[PDB]
Design an enzyme around this catalytic site. Structure first.
Site, PDB file in Angstrom:
ATOM      1  N   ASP A   1      43.005  49.579  36.236  1.00  0.00           N
ATOM      2  CA  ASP A   1      42.537  48.713  37.475  1.00  0.00           C
ATOM      3  C   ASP A   1      43.313  47.379  37.810  1.00  0.00           C
ATOM      4  O   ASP A   1      43.512  46.722  36.854  1.00  0.00           O
ATOM      5  CB  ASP A   1      41.150  48.604  37.511  1.00  0.00           C
TER       6      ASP A   1
ATOM      7  N   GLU B   1      46.059  51.429  39.378  1.00  0.00           N
ATOM      8  CA  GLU B   1      45.576  51.433  40.506  1.00  0.00           C
ATOM      9  C   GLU B   1      46.244  50.285  41.042  1.00  0.00           C
ATOM     10  O   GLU B   1      46.272  49.211  40.985  1.00  0.00           O
ATOM     11  CB  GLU B   1      44.178  50.832  40.267  1.00  0.00           C
TER      12      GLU B   1
END
Ligand SMILES: [Ca+2]
Length: 555
Positions: free
Chosen positions: A198, A252
């Site tokens: 992330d 991400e």
């Protein structure tokens, strides 16, 4: 052949809203485990679960206080290990979120780090002296205000790109990188075989922390993705960890220019395997983040096309129409009105499962779940809505009714209402009170009803997944948009080894006539939705019903 992950179908579980097994109104590991037969029967190869780690939950589990312990609300470590064993028995895999740009400020590393200037954890984070009675520099935080927070204990400021309670980890410190790698192996050695990194583009910080220039301040998110050691660190991670496993890695990626995406995913670079980007899912979102902007299918397909193009020959994309942060797929991209909900949900399924890339189905979209009918701002759990209220309503820019009307369409809470299992109390999600209200449409839209009905949205997803699994072109094949300017009917080819398939999806709630490219003809129809009859072999055109979708083999 191709890596397993290129032909796999993934399903995203937000465990908090999937299945509760102890009546506290919160979904848990045991609930996911008890539903693995359901997911297997749907045809799912791999499940991505949202953060499952020990966390004070100030940021939906993305503030992690111990990377080697589980989130207490979901269960225990043994529950987790049982989940892995039950996945393995079914030949299924698990992907987890990996949140290593920052930890919780309650992580023991940070408690140690902050305690003194001279301790072996000081440099696990970024600690700097202020300048001119102010912060070390003008860095703004994604969550508002300064990215620097002063600690009275040492008099220095610590860096947090995100929340004040999320201090950034210091990837410039080799000992820290080594801790992170050891931590990754802890999970991989338990059998985890997917990791989604992330905010991966922000790992590397700019040496010296100079002020952002006025131009940079207008897009600070981009500046934060330009750390000079970013790709060096990802390559090191690949060498020290991922070279030793068959796991898939995904980044991400946001804040960075589109043209930088290949640096993360080009296979030759030995960094990450695939990309999550947000160009499509945010394609109709206004700058204020709560209004929408009119778009057409032409915009939709052009957005898909440019991201597919950026992956090119050596990169690989994920594809998704929904996730835990966004409105419901059928409401957002289809038409969730009662006349069109099932038809359009099926059409979006055909799109999802024939896109070039690895598809991720978000929990409940296989049922055609919709946005929630919010009646009042008091119905939102969404922390973002509170912020919008303060920034737009209290400042007099908008009224509470304007805010309600619009955030109802865009709020992430739309994705977080409990999964609708059956028509029992709270849709069979829980025997208690659900942490967030169940959509009253559960009485019509639920797994129990759909699984038993060959004509359901569920059954159509399952049929498409079976077709995708047996048709190599639909996963690893090339992709060609027949007409990016067409705003009525989405048509494209997937091709591999001399076999070419045509996908045709009417995005209008009206009949449309579709002419194949001159010289192309239908050989076979694999599947259709909302159609009373397949074309004849040899057909050079289709008469499409409202929201009709189809996959055809062409001669
Ligand atoms: Ca529970």
């Amino acid at each position: 052949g191709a890596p397993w992950w290129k032909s796999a179908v993934f399903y995203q579980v937000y465990p908090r809203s999937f299945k509760d097994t102890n009546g506290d109104g919160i979904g848990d590991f045991k609930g996911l485990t008890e539903k693995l037969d359901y997911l297997k029967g749907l045809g799912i190869d791999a499940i991505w679960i949202n953060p499952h780690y020990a966390s004070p939950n100030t940021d939906n589990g993305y503030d992690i206080s111990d990377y080697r312990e589980v989130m207490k609300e979901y269960g225990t470590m043994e529950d987790f290990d049982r989940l892995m064993a039950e996945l393995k028995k079914r030949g299924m895999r698990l992907m987890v979120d990996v949140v290593i740009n920052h930890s919780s400020d309650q992580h023991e590393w940070f408690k140690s780090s902050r305690a003194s200037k001279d301790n072996p954890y000081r440099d696990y984070y970024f600690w700097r002296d202020g300048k001119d009675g102010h912060e070390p520099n003008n860095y703004p935080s994604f969550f508002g205000g300064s990215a620097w927070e002063k600690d009275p204990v040492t008099g220095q400021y610590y860096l947090h790109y995100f929340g004040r309670q999320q201090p950034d980890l210091n990837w410039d410190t080799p000992k820290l990188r080594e801790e992170l790698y050891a931590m990754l192996r802890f999970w991989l050695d338990k059998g985890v075989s997917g990791m989604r990194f992330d905010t991966v583009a922000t790992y590397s910080k700019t040496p010296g922390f100079p002020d952002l220039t006025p131009e940079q301040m207008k897009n600070f998110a981009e500046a934060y993705t330009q750390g000079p050691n970013l790709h060096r660190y990802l390559q090191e991670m690949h060498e020290k960890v991922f070279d030793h496993y068959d796991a898939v890695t995904a980044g991400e990626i946001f804040g960075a220019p589109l043209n930088q995406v290949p640096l993360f995913i080009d296979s030759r670079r030995k960094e990450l395997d695939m990309a999550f980007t947000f160009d499509l899912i945010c394609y109709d979102r206004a700058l204020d983040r709560w209004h929408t902007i009119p778009r057409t299918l032409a915009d939709f397909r052009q957005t898909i096309d440019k991201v597919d193009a950026i992956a090119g020959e050596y990169g690989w994309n994920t594809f998704f129409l929904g996730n835990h942060d966004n409105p419901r797929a059928v409401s957002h991209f289809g038409d969730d009105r009662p006349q069109w909900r099932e038809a359009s949900a099926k059409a979006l399924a055909t799109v999802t499962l024939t896109q070039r890339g690895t598809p991720f189905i978000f929990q409940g979209d296989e049922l055609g779940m919709t946005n929630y009918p919010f009646k009042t701002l008091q119905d939102f759990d969404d922390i973002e809505v509170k912020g919008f209220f303060q920034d737009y309503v209290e400042t007099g820019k908008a009224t509470a009714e304007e805010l309600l009307t619009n955030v109802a369409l865009t709020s992430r809470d739309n994705a977080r209402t409990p999964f609708q299992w059956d028509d029992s109390a709270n849709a069979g999600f829980t025997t208690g009170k659900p942490w967030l209200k169940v959509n009253p449409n559960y009485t019509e839209i639920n797994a129990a009803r759909e699984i038993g009905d060959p004509k359901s949205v569920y059954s159509f997803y399952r049929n498409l997944i079976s077709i995708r699994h047996e048709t190599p072109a639909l996963s690893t094949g090339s992709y060609r948009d027949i007409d990016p300017s067409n705003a009525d009917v989405y048509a494209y080819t997937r091709s591999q080894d001399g076999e070419t398939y045509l996908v045709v999806v009417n995005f209008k709630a009206e009949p449309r006539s579709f002419t194949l490219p001159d010289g192309m003809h239908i050989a076979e129809t694999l599947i259709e939705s909302s159609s009373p009859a397949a074309p004849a072999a040899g057909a050079a055109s289709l008469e499409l019903q409202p929201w009709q979708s189809g996959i055809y083999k062409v001669k």
